[PDB]
Write a protein that binds this ligand. Structure first.
Ligand SMILES: [Mg+2]
Ligand SMILES: [Mg+2]
Ligand SMILES: [Mg+2]
Ligand SMILES: [Mg+2]
Ligand SMILES: [Mg+2]
Ligand SMILES: [Mg+2]
Ligand SMILES: [Mg+2]
Ligand SMILES: [Mg+2]
Ligand SMILES: [Mg+2]
Ligand SMILES: [Mg+2]
Ligand SMILES: [Mg+2]
Ligand SMILES: [Mg+2]
Ligand SMILES: [Mg+2]
Ligand SMILES: [Mg+2]
Ligand SMILES: [Mg+2]
Ligand SMILES: [Mg+2]
Ligand SMILES: [Mg+2]
Ligand SMILES: [Mg+2]
Ligand SMILES: [Mg+2]
Ligand SMILES: [Mg+2]
Lengths: 127, 208, 100, 99, 116, 83, 151
RNA sequence: CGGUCCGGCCGGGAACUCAAAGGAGACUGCCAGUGAUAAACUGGAGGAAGGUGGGGAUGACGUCAAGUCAUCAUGGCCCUUACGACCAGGGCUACACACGUGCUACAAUGGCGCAUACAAAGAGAAGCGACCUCGCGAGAGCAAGCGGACCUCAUAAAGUGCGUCGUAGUCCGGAUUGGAGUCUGCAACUCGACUCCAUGAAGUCGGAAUCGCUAGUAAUCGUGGAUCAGAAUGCCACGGUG
């Protein structure tokens, strides 16, 4: 009866499984307060389940690989939105407005030849 | 200092590599030296033969050289006489058992290396470069090329001021990636210097 | 590159393959902690007595077509120039301009 | 069993060889595992294209080395020897691991 | 607060005020306080004078201000008297360790000397 | 510097020239291109003309000159000043 | 730019209060991408700010922001032989951005030890309507009415 | 799921992540308004993505007699018992000075100590080199496994939690110099890198002047590779925070 969604971010990849329950969040066999030492990521993983009022409504089992703290939090949000649209599908009209169902495609830019970074050019001098 | 090599840019799309083998890093540059020495040897021997493209492939430690040439009669000679002469020296260079196949070049006027070497041989025997460029374009557009561009460069008629000239007939889209542009370049070693010859031939677009 | 510099590279390869076992024998002695110090001293004097061109670090990887001492690539055995000319004529299998 | 590793540069010619050896061991042997694809090695290169002095003017090449893993569960005798005697095109390097 | 000849600030901790000694650093100061059995978070204040006597004995184990400066001057004047390359660098005022003198030798050469 | 397990370093032709001048008891200046040879305690009291690239400068060997190499006493760059 | 007025990007609100403005303040305070430190500094300074004021942390932030928000800035035009500093009304977004920028610059320039002490002291002085940030607001209005003839 | 040494570990399962191969997808395609019923533009609708979605490769005729005869090739000139060839040592690393490009700093948005969390992309056989032992340490010894989605390089750091310093030329900064060493390599004097102990310069944000950058950007943080016996703060790539 578990409902699944994949969320992706910069280079992260979340695997979200939704079961109806009381609101127990388990990420890589760890609690959310244990896993993300960051309140902004604790907000963004709870943002759609407070967009709708379903924090206490459903439990969830989460695995996530690759990336960093905000990357994994973004993919967790995008997986949760993918699975809540699998749960109901009447919520896509709201989560689209919330900008959540859109996968953020902002990858890092490659270092280019001549340039010290993606866009930073070296220091110029006429003389 | 501007233009990319149209073969090397078309190598993943519509052009094949002239060497299609595989090796690890231990035997890579050794195979590539053996391929260089055999293309060197075959070009010096079949210089009078209008050879265009030497394709090298080696399965199971056995080299296979596929020579594309406009006339196989001068490359073979008698049945297994000169081919066998070149085969035993290929096997001497590569150190492996060899095999030589010959693919005939239909329409030698539509092959850039043959046209460039005909122009080079003409310039070496002192003809007017504009006449050579005219005959290469008229022959290629007659034989059915959708577009040809030729270009010579440097020390033309023994002039001390080197200049470049180029003719064009038909459309030659170099920026079109699926265009079958046959491009190659020859050099004429005259008594006044080196004359460089480039030739682009557009046959049409491959719709893959 | 010059002809004499190519000749020096060939000579330094022939000597590096000739005396290769003996130099590792002496270095096994010198690197052995369980050895007589007079043996290790005689070994290091023998290693002085060997020619200098027997070492693999003495020879420099030149381009195999031109002898260019700079710009070498170990996978192709060529400099960056003859690499570009071969990759453009398609004499190098599987090698093409990348973009990502 | 026979693990078979195919290393090549052109993925069409390696998928041509992998499906060839599948239909071969399908007829002769039994239980071809599958043409499981492995990650592709991308050996990039970056060279200066000027002969003398242009540090910023470069070409960037690469070589994509395509991998294929095909396992054979029950090798018969003709399955093994007749598929080892069967050969593929050059550019493909096959590498059997019997057991 | 008076070790090996010199005074030592009281408000600082033990390892730091020991490191005020020319010849010890944070490592050797940890070796001193470990050999004296004195914690590192204490000050030179609220130390027993027996603890400070143990500290004086532990510092007396090593080479310090007048001895160390004598040994350093002896090694430099040994190179001076030999006339080696390091001696010539030490008396030309140039860098010894093989640094560049075309640019950036300003620690040994001081401030800039204008062309007059 | 070199490892202790390799010991010091000296050319064999130098160590033979030192052994000769020791047994012969001659105080001739030994000219030498071995700028990389560590001085030994049996070298004490000898004039050794170390090469510098251009000529051979004589070095009398002292006790303190033991643990060094011969090149330290043959400077290769001559510098007097700009003005 | 020449062609277009742009569409601005969306900013997250802060986790503690839900305010967009406080997260714009932590982005202006943030250096080198370290958002976690500037969020901790703001939450410590607004902690001691409500300790010193008894109000909401959001309310006393808006009060100090209100007493530093400029209304008219000036800008160089130079249509004659010299520079004319022409005044101009400031839109409420730039009013808020210049306020938080001036507050951060003053908290950098104060001599207190902790950054949260420089920022809580600067906000408490701005709510008292003194300090360098309101002095910059005054000197801006003073050059405004000293150049009000230009329009 | 069933079982556990709680480790996908072990039977297994193939969904999921991922790995590639092929294919679909976005086309102003639709809706409305403007427009000269045209081109087209603005807006919103859906949609993962909306107007060139983002990034790259791709550089027209020509210009500068631009650059390179020292990659190579080559006309012509010159040397040919030397302008050619071989070896040792030295030099290309000098040093009153001037400039360019960088690195590290001047600290408290930090130096410290302890504990702990999250990456991607690469290389590897004369190679990568676990585990274990010894050493404060760079490293040494024995030594598995690996031509490698298996093994190794290899613990990401910034971060977070606690304590600490408390505005000082400082527990900032790390130059310089002395001593002791390791490794590579015939060989580290000129002229290598690194480690340990000690030493602790200038520097407290930079004159006139000037540079880069419009979003996963700058800024900052680490990682890897080529070259290479050894030898980067450079170069080329990678992800984190943002
Ligand atoms: Mg540069
Ligand atoms: Mg300048
Ligand atoms: Mg270009
Ligand atoms: Mg030559
Ligand atoms: Mg070398
Ligand atoms: Mg001290
Ligand atoms: Mg649409
Ligand atoms: Mg010129
Ligand atoms: Mg010039
Ligand atoms: Mg020249
Ligand atoms: Mg020499
Ligand atoms: Mg130089
Ligand atoms: Mg410090
Ligand atoms: Mg920390
Ligand atoms: Mg602390
Ligand atoms: Mg000062
Ligand atoms: Mg200070
Ligand atoms: Mg190296
Ligand atoms: Mg390397
Ligand atoms: Mg980056």
């Amino acid at each position: 009866n578990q409902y699944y969604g994949t969320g992706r971010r910069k280079s992260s990849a979340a695997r979200v499984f939704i079961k109806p329950g009381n609101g127990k969040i388990v990420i890589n066999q760890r609690s959310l307060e244990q896993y993300f030492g960051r309140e902004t990521a604790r907000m963004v993983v709870r943002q759609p389940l407070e967009l709708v009022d379903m924090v206490e409504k459903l439990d969830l089992y989460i695995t996530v690989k690759g990336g960093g703290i905000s990357g994994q939090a973004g993919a967790i949000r995008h997986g949760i939105t993918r699975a809540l649209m699998e749960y109901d599908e009447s919520l896509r009209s709201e989560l689209r407005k919330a900008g959540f169902v859109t996968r953020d495609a902002r990858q890092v830019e490659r270092k280019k030849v001549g340039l010290r970074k993606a866009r930073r050019r070296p220091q110029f001098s006429k003389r | 200092g501007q233009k990319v090599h149209p073969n090397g840019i078309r190598l993943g799309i519509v052009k094949p590599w002239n060497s299609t083998w595989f090796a690890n890093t231990k035997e890579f540059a050794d195979n590539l030296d053996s391929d260089f020495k055999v293309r060197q040897y075959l070009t010096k021997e079949l210089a009078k033969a209008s050879v265009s493209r030497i394709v090298i492939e080696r399965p199971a430690k056995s080299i296979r050289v596929t020579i594309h040439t406009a006339r196989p009669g001068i490359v073979i000679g008698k049945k297994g006489e000169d081919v066998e002469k070149l085969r035993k020296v290929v096997a001497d260079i590569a150190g492996v058992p060899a095999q030589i196949n010959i693919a005939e070049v239909r329409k030698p006027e539509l092959d850039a290396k043959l046209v460039a070497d005909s122009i080079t041989s003409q310039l070496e025997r002192r003809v007017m470069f504009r006449r050579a460029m005219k005959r290469a374009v008229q022959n290629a557009m007659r034989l059915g090329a959708k577009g040809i561009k030729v270009e010579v460069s440097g020390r033309l008629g023994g002039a001390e001021i080197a200049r470049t000239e180029w003719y064009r007939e038909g459309r030659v889209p170099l920026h079109t990636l699926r265009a079958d542009i046959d491009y190659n370049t020859s050099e004429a070693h005259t008594t006044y210097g080196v004359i460089g010859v480039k030739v682009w031939i557009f046959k049409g677009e491959i719709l893959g | 590159a010059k002809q004499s510099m190519k000749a020096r590279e060939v000579k330094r390869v022939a000597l590096a393959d000739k005396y290769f076992a003996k130099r590792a024998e002496l270095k096994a002695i010198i690197s052995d902690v369980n050895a007589s110090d007079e043996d290790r001293w005689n070994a290091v004097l023998k290693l002085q007595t060997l020619p200098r061109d027997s070492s693999p670090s003495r020879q420099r990887n030149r381009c195999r077509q031109t002898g260019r001492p700079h710009g070498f690539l170990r996978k192709f055995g060529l400099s960056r120039i003859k690499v570009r000319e071969a990759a453009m004529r398609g004499e190098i299998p599987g090698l093409k301009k990348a973009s990502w | 069993r026979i693990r078979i590793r195919l290393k090549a540069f052109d993925h069409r010619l390696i998928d041509q060889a992998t499906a060839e050896i599948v239909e071969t061991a399908k007829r002769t042997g039994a239980q071809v595992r599958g043409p499981i694809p492995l990650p592709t090695r991308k050996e990039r290169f970056t060279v200066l294209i000027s002969p003398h002095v242009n540090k910023d003017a470069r070409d960037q090449y690469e070589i994509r080395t395509h991998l294929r893993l095909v396992d054979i569960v029950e090798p018969t005798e003709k399955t093994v020897d007749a598929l080892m005697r069967l050969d593929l095109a050059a550019g493909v390097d096959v590498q059997i691991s019997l057991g | 607060a008076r070790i090996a000849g010199i005074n030592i600030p009281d408000h600082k901790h033990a390892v730091i005020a020991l490191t005020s000694i020319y010849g010890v650093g944070k490592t050797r100061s940890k070796a001193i306080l470990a050999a004296a059995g004195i914690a590192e978070d204490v000050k030179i204040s609220e130390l027993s004078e027996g603890q400070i006597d143990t500290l004086r004995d532990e510092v007396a184990k090593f080479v310090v201000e007048g001895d160390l400066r004598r040994e350093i001057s002896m090694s430099i004047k040994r190179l001076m008297d030999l006339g080696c390359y390091r001696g010539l660098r030490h008396r030309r005022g140039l860098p010894v360790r093989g640094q560049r003198t075309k640019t950036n030798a300003r620690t040994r050469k001081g401030p800039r000397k204008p062309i007059k | 510097p070199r490892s202790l397990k390799k010991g010091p370093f000296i050319d064999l032709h130098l160590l033979k020239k030192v052994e000769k001048a020791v047994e012969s008891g001659d105080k001739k200046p030994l000219r030498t291109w071995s700028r990389r040879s560590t001085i030994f305690p049996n070298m004490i009291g000898l004039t050794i003309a170390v090469h510098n690239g251009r000529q051979h400068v004589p070095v009398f060997v002292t006790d303190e000159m033991v643990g060094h190499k011969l090149g330290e006493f043959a400077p290769t760059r001559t510098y007097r000043g700009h003005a | 730019p020449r062609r277009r007025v742009i569409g601005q990007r969306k900013i997250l609100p802060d986790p503690k209060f839900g305010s967009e403005l406080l997260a714009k303040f932590v982005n202006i305070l943030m250096v080198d991408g370290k958002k976690s430190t500037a969020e901790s500094i703001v939450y410590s300074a607004l902690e001691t700010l409500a300790q010193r004021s008894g109000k909401s942390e959001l309310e006393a932030f808006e009060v100090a922001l209100e007493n530093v928000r400029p209304t008219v800035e000036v800008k160089s035009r130079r249509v004659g032989g010299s520079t004319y500093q022409v005044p101009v009304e400031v839109r409420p977004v730039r009013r808020n951005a210049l306020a938080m920028r001036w507050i951060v610059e003053a908290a950098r320039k104060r001599g207190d030890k902790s950054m949260a002490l420089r920022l809580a002291n600067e906000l408490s002085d701005a709510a008292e309507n003194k300090g360098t940030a309101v002095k910059k607001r005054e000197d801006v209005h003073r050059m405004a009415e000293a150049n009000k003839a230009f329009a």
